[PDB]
Point group: D3
Chain length 163, copies 6
């Protein structure tokens, strides 16, 4: 069997979001990014000529990005943010006592500690594997999944999982 | 005299910002972009071989972008936003009664009606001409200034002024 | 009123097609390209902050490209091609007596003389104006439409219409 | 000895071709792509300062691409295509009884089962190693060869060989 | 007749050169650039489907770039450089009394005052028109020629001629 | 602990330099390039959400590039170049008896044998590790450093060190 690595990258695999980094002793001002996701896979070329169909890969990456797109990225497990539910809003109080308030529908609650490129990358990798389906990947002989998330065309973070 | 057109474009000429479009009957959720600015000018090639030194152009575009960078873009002259000053915060109330609250230092107050690519473009064009200095441009025989602002690698707006 | 130029460009605005150039005294072999379309327009910034919404522009360009995508581009008005209908196929006979046969559903019949980048550009410009709707463009104060079609990242053709 | 990885990538390393994917239970319509090839090598930096001269790498990749360029990619070992020689043409009959006919000179017969990016990649890798010459690579201490073939700027396949 | 604008741009249209800017009161240190040339032309679409064949445009731009490629760019008409012929070398003495010496074959003597992007652009425009041939351009109904030279991906100069 | 790979790449991480390759039996003419450096790191995501802050990486790469920028790259340990100190100049005599002379301030003396992309890459990797500081990288759990240097957008060399 011949091993091949597949890469799917497009300006279409994007989520335009607001966020700010906060950790112990540090907080930055509210801003945003055009985030971009590329997916890399390793496996054997199957009897149909594909390792796995690009169209399937393109479809699932678009779906994960869409869920994030056009929202403030709110880290659920942050140890430095006080996240309060006030009416139909999320109220965020920081260590330096600075206060934010956004409508809940404007926010996407993500099970992460920091809205860093590294942690958003891990979240997307976990979501993509469930979206494409793990046993479906194994039927296509895929044994390696890798996502690259860019905060900007200059700053990229890459995470992987051996499956 | 020989006419030449100069273009300065770089991922460095960027401002990573949060915003949302609001006008009559329409409001979108809070998100963000990696905005990018390119500058185009027309003039005669001077006795020093330049129309105008690229280093000067690169310096001033960076300065204008820096002022916007890492902030929520707040349109001062919006007819559909209620902008209240509450302590050290800006409180924004929309037509649909949705409420936002950001620290003042997280916001950049821009004399525009909408945080659209078109209007941000006009603002930057006006700021760049004052930053480079109008009579300084005329000594270099520059008679045309043009800025292109991109909200994303896919969406661009271009404005100009004949000087 | 402030004049602004809008540009929409994406690898998404693509049609992957087969074709060959044929004119008097010249014929090339069957091949293909990843064609790409960018749209440029000029108008005044309206009271909503837009010249025209990017989402509308992105939607219509995708629709025009989709109609062409994944087909052999067949020039209807070619003076050097003999196009015969044989069962459910198009049979193409060239000046040098070379013969092609494709299923009809594999072909897209385009009202052009040559499948050149220039002529495909004109066709798309005409189709896009009808797709976006001419009187709709005039309500947005758009007076200039321009399409750029690339045969390759290296070879581009640009056509326009004053509206 | 210091290990270095060399990459050669250019829009020049291209073959503009027609093709369609066909396997068991699936057939797509005739279309085309601007295919692009990049080559990656690993080895030790030699006494002349190079692992291997870029000019040699650039020359051989161009030669392999040229052989494919401007043709319909015809898979020789397809289990779902009936390839008939009719006069100076190749007649291709599919499982769904759809019929194609191209002049032989318009086709490039490649020892593959499917004209997929994965299989075209493997073919090019095999051809490039023979073109650069295997024992010539070993004299330059090259122990790893890797080709990346893109069907589009969005879809890439990568294969390698340890030498 | 339908007007179309043709653009040819490639990393292939390059000349990798050494140079330094010198004018009255200013001199910079010796360095180099990967210069890149793109050509833009306007004309009517001819009866063969082309305004002008891209292959002809690609061939002539490559020829002009090749003449410059791999040399020190020496401005012949500089008012601040003392250019002496010493044996098989060019000896260059600057205003600040700094001395350079290169073999003559390493230098390309260009009829310009400064090795600026603007002036190199003008030279290439003049050379390209003569290389493609002026009356040949008029037979193809070309009435506009435009070259863009980039010193870097960030700094570009564009010049034109109405023909 | 979760392993993440960080990539920092920008047209800003550049050094525009003059050079020529010389080794046994071969010498090329003086020319130049827009060199570009990208940095790749592997480590665990720390309690602050970062493997290592991008801003620190961006700052140090800029500093190393700046030291090289706007100079002739002079290889100190070349076995085929006779490097003489004449007044305030470096005089370079080659095997074929060709002579160069540059002011010392125009040259950057680099502890390498050839000004190849491979060897410049190794030098930068060594300089970057000392600039970021080795024990500082170990506190951030970084165990892999990798630099990619491009002579042109087409030609790249990549070197690494396991730390
Ligand atoms: C400056 C802005 O990009 C900020 O959000 C920032 C700064 N440094 C960073 N550093 C890393 N490693 N990851 C990030 O997401 C990151 N993010
Ligand atoms: C610094 C110098 O070598 C180079 O970067 C530079 C700077 N400014 C410039 N400015 C103009 N107008 N043209 C140039 O070629 C130019 N070139
Ligand atoms: C959806 C919105 O946030 C953004 O994608 C968008 C959409 N359409 C737009 N349309 C115009 N004209 N200008 C914009 O800035 C713009 N911006
Ligand atoms: C849609 C078009 O690209 C089609 O030819 C296609 C679809 N899916 C694919 N999927 C893979 N993995 N490789 C291909 O070459 C490929 N090719
Ligand atoms: C060779 C041919 O298939 C293609 O590369 C080509 C070459 N020259 C061209 N020239 C023009 N003007 N338009 C084209 O579409 C064109 N297209
Ligand atoms: C042609 C020009 O790039 C020349 O300096 C050159 C040629 N071949 C090369 N080959 C390698 N491997 N590395 C180089 O830096 C290199 N450099
Ligand atoms: Zn950020
Ligand atoms: Zn937006
Ligand atoms: Zn073609
Ligand atoms: Zn395809
Ligand atoms: Zn320079
Ligand atoms: Zn070189």
């Amino acid at each position: 069997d011949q091993i091949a690595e597949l890469l799917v990258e497009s300006p279409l695999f994007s989520f335009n979001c607001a966020h700010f980094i906060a950790f112990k002793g540090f907080r930055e001002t509210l801003h945003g990014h055009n985030y971009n996701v590329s997916l890399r896979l390793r496996g054997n070329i199957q009897g149909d000529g594909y390792v796995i169909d690009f169209s399937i890969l393109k479809e699932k990456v678009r779906k994960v990005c869409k869920q994030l797109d056009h929202h403030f990225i709110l880290p659920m497990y942050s140890d430095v943010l006080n996240i309060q539910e006030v009416n139909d809003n999320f109220k965020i109080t920081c260590e330096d006592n600075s206060e934010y308030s956004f409508p809940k529908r404007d926010c996407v609650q993500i099970p992460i500690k920091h809205s860093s490129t590294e942690e958003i990358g891990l979240y997307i990798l976990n979501q993509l594997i469930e979206e494409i389906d793990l046993p479906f990947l194994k039927t296509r002989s895929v044994n390696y999944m890798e996502v690259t998330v860019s905060e900007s065309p200059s700053q990229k973070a890459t995470v992987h999982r051996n499956i």
